[PDB]
Protein backbone atom coordinates (compact mmCIF):
# COMPACT_ATOMS: atom_id res chain seq x y z
CA UNK A 1 0.00 0.00 0.00
CA UNK A 2 1.61 3.07 -1.57
CA UNK A 3 0.87 6.57 -0.16
CA UNK A 4 1.15 9.61 -2.27
CA UNK A 5 1.91 12.75 -0.45
CA UNK A 6 1.31 16.04 -1.96
CA UNK A 7 2.25 19.18 -0.65
CA UNK A 8 1.12 23.22 -1.55
CA UNK A 9 2.17 26.50 -0.47
CA UNK A 10 5.00 27.60 0.91
CA UNK A 11 3.70 26.66 4.60
CA UNK A 12 2.86 23.06 2.72
CA UNK A 13 6.88 22.89 1.80
CA UNK A 14 7.85 23.61 5.25
CA UNK A 15 5.35 21.40 6.88
CA UNK A 16 6.68 18.63 4.15
CA UNK A 17 10.52 19.37 5.11
CA UNK A 18 10.24 18.78 8.84
CA UNK A 19 7.81 15.82 8.22
CA UNK A 20 10.35 14.32 5.76
CA UNK A 21 13.03 15.49 8.64
CA UNK A 22 11.41 13.65 10.78
CA UNK A 23 10.36 10.52 9.11
CA UNK A 24 14.01 10.18 8.06
CA UNK A 25 15.27 10.81 11.47
CA UNK A 26 13.19 7.77 12.42
CA UNK A 27 13.95 5.29 9.73
CA UNK A 28 17.89 6.16 9.85
CA UNK A 29 18.19 7.43 6.68
CA UNK A 30 20.06 10.86 7.23
CA UNK A 31 20.53 13.94 4.89
CA UNK A 32 22.35 11.46 2.22
CA UNK A 33 19.94 8.98 1.49
CA UNK A 34 21.53 5.86 2.86
CA UNK A 35 21.41 3.64 4.93
CA UNK A 36 22.73 4.02 9.03
CA UNK A 37 23.27 0.09 10.00
CA UNK A 38 26.58 -0.83 10.69
CA UNK A 39 25.65 -4.06 8.39
CA UNK A 40 23.08 -4.15 5.85
CA UNK A 41 22.49 -8.36 5.56
CA UNK A 42 20.26 -8.44 8.34
CA UNK A 43 16.74 -7.92 8.20
CA UNK A 44 14.51 -4.69 9.13
CA UNK A 45 11.64 -4.84 11.59
CA UNK A 46 9.72 -2.24 9.64
CA UNK A 47 8.58 -1.44 5.71
CA UNK A 48 9.83 1.69 4.64
CA UNK A 49 8.56 1.26 0.82
CA UNK A 50 5.03 2.55 1.36
CA UNK A 51 6.70 6.21 1.78
CA UNK A 52 10.10 5.94 0.14
CA UNK A 53 11.42 4.19 -3.05
CA UNK A 54 14.00 1.98 -3.07
CA UNK A 55 16.97 1.81 -5.52
CA UNK A 56 20.09 -0.47 -6.05
CA UNK A 57 22.21 1.68 -4.39
CA UNK A 58 20.22 1.83 -1.66
CA UNK A 59 19.19 5.45 -2.24
CA UNK A 60 15.73 6.43 -1.07
CA UNK A 61 13.89 8.45 -2.73
CA UNK A 62 10.78 10.31 -0.97
CA UNK A 63 7.42 10.09 -3.16
CA UNK A 64 6.65 13.76 -2.62
CA UNK A 65 5.42 16.18 -4.81
CA UNK A 66 5.95 20.11 -4.35
CA UNK A 67 3.80 23.35 -6.01
CA UNK A 68 5.20 26.48 -6.02
CA UNK A 69 4.95 29.72 -7.78
CA UNK A 70 8.61 31.05 -6.44
CA UNK A 71 11.23 28.84 -6.16
CA UNK A 72 13.07 30.95 -3.87
CA UNK A 73 11.40 28.82 -0.34
CA UNK A 74 11.10 25.68 -2.31
CA UNK A 75 15.08 25.48 -2.92
CA UNK A 76 15.93 25.68 0.64
CA UNK A 77 14.63 22.43 1.69
CA UNK A 78 16.91 20.85 -1.29
CA UNK A 79 19.71 22.98 0.25
CA UNK A 80 19.77 21.72 3.53
CA UNK A 81 19.18 18.20 2.04
CA UNK A 82 21.29 17.55 -0.51
CA UNK A 83 20.33 14.72 -3.13
CA UNK A 84 17.66 13.50 -1.10
CA UNK A 85 14.41 15.02 -2.94
CA UNK A 86 14.00 14.36 -6.57
CA UNK A 87 14.10 17.75 -8.61
CA UNK A 88 11.57 16.85 -11.11
CA UNK A 89 8.67 16.66 -8.76
CA UNK A 90 8.49 19.76 -7.77
CA UNK A 91 6.78 22.57 -9.92
CA UNK A 92 7.58 26.47 -10.15
CA UNK A 93 5.31 29.23 -11.93
CA UNK A 94 7.05 31.77 -13.74
CA UNK A 95 5.34 35.56 -14.00
CA UNK A 96 2.09 34.22 -12.45
CA UNK A 97 0.49 35.97 -9.55
CA UNK A 98 0.79 38.90 -7.26
CA UNK A 99 2.03 38.69 -3.39
CA UNK A 100 -0.34 37.52 -0.89
CA UNK A 101 -3.07 37.61 -3.93
CA UNK A 102 -6.78 35.91 -3.41
CA UNK A 103 -7.16 32.17 -4.05
CA UNK A 104 -8.59 33.26 -8.38
CA UNK A 105 -5.31 33.35 -9.91
CA UNK A 106 -3.88 30.73 -8.17
CA UNK A 107 -6.85 28.32 -9.41
CA UNK A 108 -6.69 30.22 -13.43
CA UNK A 109 -2.76 28.68 -13.29
CA UNK A 110 -4.16 26.11 -12.02
CA UNK A 111 -6.39 24.79 -14.50
CA UNK A 112 -3.83 26.21 -17.39
CA UNK A 113 -0.90 23.68 -16.21
CA UNK A 114 -3.20 20.65 -14.54
CA UNK A 115 -1.92 18.85 -17.41
CA UNK A 116 1.72 18.79 -16.87
CA UNK A 117 0.74 17.87 -13.22
CA UNK A 118 -1.51 15.25 -14.36
CA UNK A 119 1.36 13.81 -16.48
CA UNK A 120 3.88 13.85 -13.36
CA UNK A 121 1.51 12.35 -10.65
CA UNK A 122 0.72 9.93 -13.60
CA UNK A 123 4.42 9.31 -14.23
CA UNK A 124 5.11 8.86 -10.59
CA UNK A 125 1.95 6.67 -9.75
CA UNK A 126 3.09 4.05 -12.74
CA UNK A 127 7.00 3.71 -10.70
CA UNK A 128 4.78 1.36 -8.07
CA UNK A 129 2.34 -1.46 -8.00
CA UNK A 130 0.30 -1.42 -4.91
CA UNK A 131 -1.25 2.08 -4.65
CA UNK A 132 -3.71 3.15 -1.73
CA UNK A 133 -4.28 6.83 -1.79
CA UNK A 134 -3.51 10.39 -1.50
CA UNK A 135 -2.59 13.14 1.23
CA UNK A 136 -3.22 16.68 0.62
CA UNK A 137 -1.11 19.34 2.59
CA UNK A 138 -1.64 22.98 2.36
CA UNK A 139 -3.26 25.90 4.20
CA UNK A 140 -6.76 28.22 2.64
CA UNK A 141 -5.35 31.33 3.59
CA UNK A 142 -2.72 31.56 1.35
CA UNK A 143 -4.11 32.27 -2.61
CA UNK A 144 -2.29 30.34 -5.26
CA UNK A 145 -1.24 27.55 -2.95
CA UNK A 146 -5.13 26.88 -2.35
CA UNK A 147 -5.95 26.96 -5.41
CA UNK A 148 -3.64 24.70 -7.03
CA UNK A 149 -4.40 22.45 -4.14
CA UNK A 150 -8.68 22.65 -5.29
CA UNK A 151 -7.68 22.17 -8.89
CA UNK A 152 -5.41 19.24 -7.69
CA UNK A 153 -7.91 17.93 -5.12
CA UNK A 154 -10.63 18.18 -7.85
CA UNK A 155 -8.63 16.43 -10.66
CA UNK A 156 -7.45 13.64 -8.32
CA UNK A 157 -11.48 12.95 -7.11
CA UNK A 158 -12.89 12.92 -10.51
CA UNK A 159 -10.21 10.71 -12.45
CA UNK A 160 -9.94 8.75 -9.48
CA UNK A 161 -12.80 6.97 -8.02
CA UNK A 162 -11.53 4.09 -6.26
CA UNK A 163 -8.19 6.03 -4.48
CA UNK A 164 -8.65 7.69 -1.14
CA UNK A 165 -8.53 11.17 -0.58
CA UNK A 166 -7.11 12.76 3.05
CA UNK A 167 -6.16 16.85 2.97
CA UNK A 168 -4.28 18.25 5.93
CA UNK A 169 -5.38 22.25 6.33
CA UNK A 170 -4.21 25.20 7.92
CA UNK A 171 -6.24 28.30 9.28
CA UNK A 172 -4.76 31.43 10.25
CA UNK A 173 -5.92 32.82 13.30
CA UNK A 174 -8.03 35.33 14.12
CA UNK A 175 -5.98 38.90 13.25
CA UNK A 176 -7.03 41.80 11.48
CA UNK A 177 -5.52 41.64 8.06
CA UNK A 178 -7.07 37.83 8.08
CA UNK A 179 -10.54 39.92 6.64
CA UNK A 180 -9.76 38.85 3.23
CA UNK A 181 -7.88 35.60 4.25
CA UNK A 182 -10.54 34.23 5.38
CA UNK A 183 -12.52 35.67 2.47
CA UNK A 184 -11.19 34.01 0.10
CA UNK A 185 -10.97 30.82 2.31
CA UNK A 186 -14.87 31.01 2.17
CA UNK A 187 -14.60 29.11 -1.25
CA UNK A 188 -11.39 27.54 -1.23
CA UNK A 189 -14.06 25.32 1.87
CA UNK A 190 -15.84 24.06 -1.42
CA UNK A 191 -13.28 21.40 -2.66
CA UNK A 192 -13.42 19.94 0.70
CA UNK A 193 -16.47 20.01 1.09
CA UNK A 194 -17.37 17.82 -1.61
CA UNK A 195 -13.69 15.97 -2.83
CA UNK A 196 -12.30 15.53 0.22
CA UNK A 197 -13.31 12.01 2.20
CA UNK A 198 -10.82 12.66 5.09
CA UNK A 199 -9.52 15.99 6.43
CA UNK A 200 -7.91 17.28 9.58
CA UNK A 201 -7.82 21.04 10.22
CA UNK A 202 -5.19 23.57 11.94
CA UNK A 203 -5.64 26.87 13.64
CA UNK A 204 -2.58 29.06 14.69
CA UNK A 205 -4.06 30.00 17.79
CA UNK A 206 -3.73 26.38 19.80
CA UNK A 207 -0.29 26.21 17.99
CA UNK A 208 1.05 29.54 19.43
CA UNK A 209 -0.19 28.50 23.12
CA UNK A 210 1.30 25.21 22.60
CA UNK A 211 4.36 26.46 21.81
CA UNK A 212 4.06 29.62 24.51
CA UNK A 213 4.04 26.71 26.54
CA UNK A 214 6.70 24.37 25.53
CA UNK A 215 9.40 25.86 24.61
CA UNK A 216 11.46 28.39 26.21
CA UNK A 217 11.51 32.09 25.17
CA UNK A 218 8.62 32.34 23.31
CA UNK A 219 8.36 35.09 20.34
CA UNK A 220 7.29 33.42 17.25
CA UNK A 221 7.07 29.74 16.77
CA UNK A 222 6.16 29.02 13.16
CA UNK A 223 9.19 26.27 12.90
CA UNK A 224 7.23 24.93 16.54
CA UNK A 225 3.60 24.79 14.49
CA UNK A 226 5.18 23.08 11.37
CA UNK A 227 6.99 20.98 13.74
CA UNK A 228 3.46 19.92 15.33
CA UNK A 229 1.71 19.43 12.47
CA UNK A 230 4.90 16.95 11.63
CA UNK A 231 4.60 15.00 14.51
CA UNK A 232 0.83 14.83 14.32
CA UNK A 233 1.16 13.14 11.02
CA UNK A 234 4.08 10.72 12.10
CA UNK A 235 2.12 9.49 15.06
CA UNK A 236 -1.12 9.36 12.74
CA UNK A 237 0.86 7.22 9.93
CA UNK A 238 3.14 5.38 12.66
CA UNK A 239 0.40 2.41 12.88
CA UNK A 240 0.92 2.00 8.94
CA UNK A 241 4.80 2.17 8.94
CA UNK A 242 5.52 0.17 11.86
CA UNK A 243 3.55 -3.46 11.16
CA UNK A 244 0.33 -4.16 14.35
CA UNK A 245 -1.37 -6.66 14.93
CA UNK A 246 -4.92 -4.83 13.22
CA UNK A 247 -4.33 -1.60 11.56
CA UNK A 248 -2.49 -1.99 8.22
CA UNK A 249 -4.25 0.57 5.82
CA UNK A 250 -5.54 3.79 6.24
CA UNK A 251 -8.75 2.80 5.06
CA UNK A 252 -9.21 0.71 8.12
CA UNK A 253 -8.27 3.90 10.09
CA UNK A 254 -10.80 6.42 8.50
CA UNK A 255 -13.42 4.03 8.41
CA UNK A 256 -13.92 3.74 12.15
CA UNK A 257 -14.00 7.78 12.75
CA UNK A 258 -15.84 8.90 9.46
CA UNK A 259 -19.73 8.76 9.39
CA UNK A 260 -21.91 9.47 6.11
CA UNK A 261 -19.95 11.37 3.81
CA UNK A 262 -21.15 14.70 6.07
CA UNK A 263 -19.21 14.95 9.11
CA UNK A 264 -15.73 14.35 8.04
CA UNK A 265 -14.60 17.28 10.05
CA UNK A 266 -11.87 15.79 12.60
CA UNK A 267 -10.10 17.52 15.60
CA UNK A 268 -6.94 16.26 16.59
CA UNK A 269 -5.02 15.81 19.95
CA UNK A 270 -1.80 14.96 21.48
CA UNK A 271 0.23 14.34 24.70
CA UNK A 272 2.56 17.45 25.96
CA UNK A 273 5.56 14.65 25.22
CA UNK A 274 6.67 16.12 21.91
CA UNK A 275 8.70 14.19 19.51
CA UNK A 276 12.15 16.95 18.77
CA UNK A 277 12.25 19.83 28.92
CA UNK A 278 10.68 16.74 26.69
CA UNK A 279 11.66 14.26 30.29
CA UNK A 280 8.68 15.56 32.05
CA UNK A 281 5.15 15.53 31.81
CA UNK A 282 5.12 11.29 30.62
CA UNK A 283 4.26 9.64 33.29
CA UNK A 284 2.34 7.08 32.30
CA UNK A 285 -0.39 5.83 29.85
CA UNK A 286 -3.23 6.59 32.88
CA UNK A 287 -2.23 10.31 32.45
CA UNK A 288 -2.28 10.55 28.94
CA UNK A 289 -5.79 9.26 28.64
CA UNK A 290 -6.42 11.40 31.62
CA UNK A 291 -5.10 14.71 29.93
CA UNK A 292 -6.19 13.63 26.35
CA UNK A 293 -9.58 14.98 27.13
CA UNK A 294 -8.04 18.51 28.24
CA UNK A 295 -9.51 21.21 26.44
CA UNK A 296 -6.05 23.11 26.82
CA UNK A 297 -4.65 20.19 24.54
CA UNK A 298 -6.82 20.49 21.67
CA UNK A 299 -5.11 22.01 18.38
CA UNK A 300 -7.98 24.62 17.79
CA UNK A 301 -9.31 26.84 20.71
CA UNK A 302 -12.62 25.48 21.62
CA UNK A 303 -14.92 26.28 24.73
CA UNK A 304 -15.65 23.52 27.64
CA UNK A 305 -19.49 23.19 27.61
CA UNK A 306 -20.98 19.01 28.01
CA UNK A 307 -19.19 18.43 24.23
CA UNK A 308 -20.73 15.86 22.25
CA UNK A 309 -18.71 13.52 20.84
CA UNK A 310 -19.17 11.24 17.93
CA UNK A 311 -16.29 9.35 17.60
CA UNK A 312 -13.31 9.34 19.82
CA UNK A 313 -9.75 7.24 17.87
CA UNK A 314 -6.47 6.92 20.21
CA UNK A 315 -3.12 6.14 19.72
CA UNK A 316 -0.27 5.34 22.19
CA UNK A 317 2.93 4.71 20.93
CA UNK A 318 5.58 2.50 23.72
CA UNK A 319 5.24 0.39 26.50
CA UNK A 320 1.99 0.03 27.81
CA UNK A 321 0.03 -1.83 30.58
CA UNK A 322 -3.19 -3.25 30.16
CA UNK A 323 -5.00 -2.53 33.92
CA UNK A 324 -4.36 1.19 33.24
CA UNK A 325 -6.11 1.04 29.80
CA UNK A 326 -8.53 -0.82 31.20
CA UNK A 327 -9.43 1.56 34.28
CA UNK A 328 -9.22 4.54 31.44
CA UNK A 329 -11.55 3.29 29.13
CA UNK A 330 -14.06 2.18 32.61
CA UNK A 331 -13.70 5.61 33.83
CA UNK A 332 -13.85 7.81 30.55
CA UNK A 333 -16.81 5.66 29.26
CA UNK A 334 -18.88 7.74 32.30
CA UNK A 335 -17.12 10.94 31.63
CA UNK A 336 -17.27 11.64 27.98
CA UNK A 337 -20.73 11.81 26.11
CA UNK A 338 -22.14 10.72 23.61
CA UNK A 339 -25.57 11.18 21.30
CA UNK A 340 -28.21 8.86 22.27
CA UNK A 341 -28.88 8.17 18.65
CA UNK A 342 -25.33 6.06 18.35
CA UNK A 343 -23.41 4.18 20.18
CA UNK A 344 -20.32 4.53 22.16
CA UNK A 345 -17.47 4.97 19.57
CA UNK A 346 -13.62 4.71 22.03
CA UNK A 347 -11.21 3.03 19.71
CA UNK A 348 -7.44 2.24 21.24
CA UNK A 349 -4.02 2.03 18.68
CA UNK A 350 -1.29 0.82 21.06
CA UNK A 351 1.40 0.98 18.72
CA UNK A 352 5.23 0.37 18.66
CA UNK A 353 8.62 2.25 19.28
CA UNK A 354 10.72 3.25 16.64
CA UNK A 355 13.84 0.70 17.13
CA UNK A 356 16.13 2.86 15.39
CA UNK A 357 16.37 6.19 16.83
CA UNK A 358 18.86 6.20 20.42
CA UNK A 359 15.46 6.71 22.95
CA UNK A 360 15.57 7.15 26.07
CA UNK A 361 14.02 3.63 27.06
CA UNK A 362 11.64 3.65 30.44
CA UNK A 363 9.89 0.99 31.95
CA UNK A 364 6.92 2.95 31.60
CA UNK A 365 7.76 6.14 29.30
CA UNK A 366 4.56 6.15 26.98
CA UNK A 367 2.97 8.88 24.39
CA UNK A 368 -0.42 9.29 22.94
CA UNK A 369 -2.69 11.29 20.62
CA UNK A 370 -6.55 11.41 19.78
CA UNK A 371 -8.54 12.19 16.46
CA UNK A 372 -12.16 12.94 17.46
CA UNK A 373 -15.00 13.91 15.69
CA UNK A 374 -16.67 17.59 16.66
CA UNK A 375 -19.32 19.33 16.62
CA UNK A 376 -17.45 22.51 17.56
CA UNK A 377 -15.44 22.31 14.67
CA UNK A 378 -18.58 24.24 13.47
CA UNK A 379 -16.56 27.48 15.70
CA UNK A 380 -13.58 28.30 12.87
CA UNK A 381 -16.03 28.03 10.61
CA UNK A 382 -18.36 30.91 12.22
CA UNK A 383 -15.25 32.92 13.23
CA UNK A 384 -14.77 33.37 9.38
CA UNK A 385 -18.59 33.89 8.64
CA UNK A 386 -18.85 36.62 10.88
CA UNK A 387 -16.73 38.74 9.43
CA UNK A 388 -17.63 38.38 5.49
CA UNK A 389 -21.34 38.41 6.78
CA UNK A 390 -21.08 42.01 6.88
CA UNK A 391 -18.38 43.64 5.18
CA UNK A 392 -19.41 41.65 1.73
CA UNK A 393 -22.12 44.24 0.69
CA UNK A 394 -19.75 47.39 -0.34
CA UNK A 395 -16.82 45.28 -1.36
CA UNK A 396 -14.69 48.22 -2.06
CA UNK A 397 -11.71 46.77 -1.15
CA UNK A 398 -12.84 43.04 -1.73
CA UNK A 399 -13.23 43.48 -5.76
CA UNK A 400 -10.03 44.68 -6.54
CA UNK A 401 -8.03 41.41 -5.74
CA UNK A 402 -10.16 40.07 -8.88
CA UNK A 403 -11.78 37.00 -6.75
CA UNK A 404 -13.59 35.07 -9.46
CA UNK A 405 -12.49 32.54 -12.40
CA UNK A 406 -14.11 35.44 -14.57
CA UNK A 407 -12.44 38.86 -14.45
CA UNK A 408 -14.39 42.29 -13.94
CA UNK A 409 -17.45 39.85 -14.20
CA UNK A 410 -19.11 40.52 -10.56
CA UNK A 411 -22.52 38.86 -11.12
CA UNK A 412 -20.49 35.31 -11.51
CA UNK A 413 -18.20 35.99 -8.37
CA UNK A 414 -21.48 37.12 -6.20
CA UNK A 415 -23.22 33.64 -7.54
CA UNK A 416 -20.23 31.95 -6.67
CA UNK A 417 -19.96 33.32 -3.03
CA UNK A 418 -23.62 32.87 -2.71
CA UNK A 419 -23.11 29.06 -3.48
CA UNK A 420 -20.47 29.00 -1.40
CA UNK A 421 -22.33 30.39 1.75
CA UNK A 422 -25.36 28.18 1.22
CA UNK A 423 -23.52 25.21 1.41
CA UNK A 424 -21.51 26.45 3.90
CA UNK A 425 -24.66 26.80 5.73
CA UNK A 426 -25.89 23.58 4.78
CA UNK A 427 -22.82 22.41 6.28
CA UNK A 428 -23.68 24.30 9.23
CA UNK A 429 -27.50 23.02 9.35
CA UNK A 430 -26.06 19.09 8.98
CA UNK A 431 -23.72 19.76 12.23
CA UNK A 432 -26.76 21.29 13.79
CA UNK A 433 -29.04 18.34 13.57
CA UNK A 434 -27.18 15.74 14.15
CA UNK A 435 -26.25 17.30 17.54
CA UNK A 436 -30.20 18.56 18.27
CA UNK A 437 -31.37 14.91 18.33
CA UNK A 438 -33.87 15.55 15.69
CA UNK A 439 -33.66 11.69 14.43
CA UNK A 440 -34.63 10.55 18.69
CA UNK B 1 7.58 38.41 8.91
CA UNK B 2 11.64 39.54 7.85
CA UNK B 3 12.30 40.30 11.57
CA UNK B 4 9.97 37.20 12.82
CA UNK B 5 12.29 35.25 10.92
CA UNK B 6 15.67 36.96 12.49
CA UNK B 7 14.28 36.70 15.90
CA UNK B 8 13.57 33.16 15.37
CA UNK B 9 17.09 32.37 13.68
CA UNK B 10 17.90 34.27 17.15
CA UNK B 11 15.94 31.34 19.26
CA UNK B 12 18.05 28.82 16.77
CA UNK B 13 21.32 30.77 17.76
CA UNK B 14 20.72 30.99 21.62
CA UNK B 15 19.82 27.18 21.47
CA UNK B 16 22.77 26.20 20.06
CA UNK B 17 25.07 28.41 22.10
CA UNK B 18 23.44 26.60 24.77
CA UNK B 19 24.26 23.26 23.48
CA UNK B 20 27.94 24.83 23.33
N1 LIG C 1 1.20 25.50 8.55
C1 LIG C 1 1.84 26.69 8.63
N2 LIG C 1 1.26 27.80 8.08
C2 LIG C 1 1.87 29.00 8.14
C3 LIG C 1 3.17 29.10 8.82
N3 LIG C 1 3.55 30.39 8.74
C4 LIG C 1 2.58 31.06 8.07
N4 LIG C 1 1.57 30.24 7.72
C5 LIG C 1 0.36 30.63 6.97
O1 LIG C 1 0.36 29.98 5.69
C6 LIG C 1 0.01 30.90 4.65
C7 LIG C 1 0.88 30.61 3.43
O2 LIG C 1 0.65 31.57 2.40
P1 LIG C 1 1.35 31.37 0.97
O3 LIG C 1 0.60 30.34 0.16
O4 LIG C 1 2.80 30.96 1.14
O5 LIG C 1 1.26 32.82 0.27
P2 LIG C 1 2.21 33.17 -0.98
O6 LIG C 1 3.63 33.35 -0.48
O7 LIG C 1 1.74 34.46 -1.63
O8 LIG C 1 2.17 32.05 -1.99
C8 LIG C 1 0.22 32.29 5.20
O9 LIG C 1 -0.91 33.12 4.91
C9 LIG C 1 0.38 32.13 6.70
O10 LIG C 1 -0.70 32.76 7.38
C10 LIG C 1 3.73 27.85 9.40
O11 LIG C 1 4.83 27.84 9.99
N5 LIG C 1 3.02 26.73 9.27
Known sequence: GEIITLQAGQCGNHVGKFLWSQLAKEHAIGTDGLSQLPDSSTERDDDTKPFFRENSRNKFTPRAIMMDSEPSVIADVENTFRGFFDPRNTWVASDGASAGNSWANGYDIGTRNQDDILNKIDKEIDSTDNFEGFQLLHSVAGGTGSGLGSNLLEALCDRY????????????????????????????????????????????????????????????????????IST????????????????????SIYSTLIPSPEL???????????????????????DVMLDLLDPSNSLVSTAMNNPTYFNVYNTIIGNVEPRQISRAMTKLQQRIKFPSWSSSAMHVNIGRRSPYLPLQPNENEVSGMMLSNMSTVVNVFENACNTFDKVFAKGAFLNNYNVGDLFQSMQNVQDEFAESREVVQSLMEDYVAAEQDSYL | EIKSL????????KEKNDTL
Open chain 1, 161 to 228: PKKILTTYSVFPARSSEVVVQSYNTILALRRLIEDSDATVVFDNASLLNISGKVFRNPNIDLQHTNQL
Open chain 1, 232 to 251: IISSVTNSIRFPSYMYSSMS
Open chain 1, 264 to 286: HFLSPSFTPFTSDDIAHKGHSSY
Open chain 2, 6 to 13: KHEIKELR
